[PDB]
Amino acid sequence: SGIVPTLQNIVATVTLGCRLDLKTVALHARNAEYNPKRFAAVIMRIREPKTTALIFASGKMVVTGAKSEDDSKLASRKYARIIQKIGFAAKFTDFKIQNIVGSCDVKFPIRLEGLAFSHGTFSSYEPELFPGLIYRMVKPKIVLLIFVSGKIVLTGAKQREEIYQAFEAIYPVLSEFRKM
DNA sequence: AACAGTAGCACGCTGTGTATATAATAGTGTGTTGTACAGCACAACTGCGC
């Protein structure tokens, strides 16, 4: 082994606590998009940490694109400050990470059909529909996308340890189904 | 007759469908409920006439 998964995307939610006028928000923000007809939220962005926020009239906000939990909270506080600077009585509350995505490379090809047959109740593999095997782990409850190349995607985690836990649990199985 | 330029065709590369999680919230679609409108031979009935 020796491989440890790399975090790729962190999704979080934040309650600003006050109602927002989206045209005002979009108008005053330096990096905003807002087309009511397409989606009901201002799509705001900041350069550091590089992230994207979906800002709603209710004052709720979704922050995505961060590569670390630190970066997620940091960028979230920053978006909240922007809203304040524009003039609303916003508050940075209820910061919570909802989804963590990770990925790695085991460095060997995998026999997906064998794995799907062996771990049938957790696996779903339809190569004509999507080339990767969808593995639904029980403990921890994580979803893994397994590819012939040996590249692995882990998602559905609320905490970093779950990403790490799942990979540790899957590695022996990937080894059992290697090609070379 | 030869050379240069322009147009057309073919090939290669980049971008967007499929799948995973996860939050946000008002809309859109579907289903259900309510209201309104549109071959014998003999056996029995029944029908007609006295």
CA A178 to C1' B11, in angstroms, rounded, equals 37
Query: What stretches of A2-59 adopt beta strand conformation (E)?
Result: 6-15, 32-33, 42-46, 51-55
DSSP H helices, chain A, are 22-28, 69-86, 112-118, 160-176
Please work out, in degrees rounded to the nearest 5, the angle formed at the alpha carbon of residue A158 by the alpha carbons of A89 and A55. 30
Nearest nucleotide, CA A60 to C1': B24
Positions of chain B reached by protein Cβ under 7 A = 18-26
- Are A163 and A5 in contact by the 8 Å Cβ rule? The answer is yes
Among A47, A65, A61, A50, smallest CA distance to A8 is for A65
Name the DSSP class of A110.
B
* Elucidated via: cryo-EM
Q: Which helix (H) or strand (E) holds A61?
A: strand A60-66
- Are A103 and A170 in contact by the 8 Å Cβ rule? The answer is no
Task: Report resolution in angstroms.
Answer: 7.8
CA A18 to C1' B23, in angstroms, rounded, equals 18
